[PDB]
């Protein structure tokens, strides 16, 4: 039990990591295709001066 | 009572490795869908 409980606990820990993970990534994700869409407007944008 | 104990303590083994089992799952099906994002990263940088 006492092992069992150790690595419970470890699991538990790393399973909190990776929901974080998940939060800052998707926060990364808006941020990037905010970008994403900018940059590709003011591609065409180009498109249409060239 | 003795015996009573026993039994308890290999229900609260039991119990623990449920748990336990719990938390593995959790932590790999997670890991997956990072794994999933983390190719779509990729896939977005050579996008831009």
């Known amino acids: 039990i006492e092992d069992k409980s150790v690595e419970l606990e470890n699991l538990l820990n790393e399973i909190a990591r990776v929901k974080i993970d998940q939060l800052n990534t998707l926060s990364q994700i808006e941020v990037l295709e905010n970008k994403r869409r900018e940059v590709i407007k003011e591609r065409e944008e180009k498109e249409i001066t060239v | ?48």
């Open chain 2, 1 to 48: 009572y003795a015996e009573e104990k026993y039994r308890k303590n290999e229900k609260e083994k039991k119990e623990l490795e449920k748990e336990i089992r719990t938390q593995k799952e959790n932590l790999f099906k997670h890991t997956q869908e990072l794994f999933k994002h983390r190719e779509r990263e990729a896939n977005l940088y050579g996008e831009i």
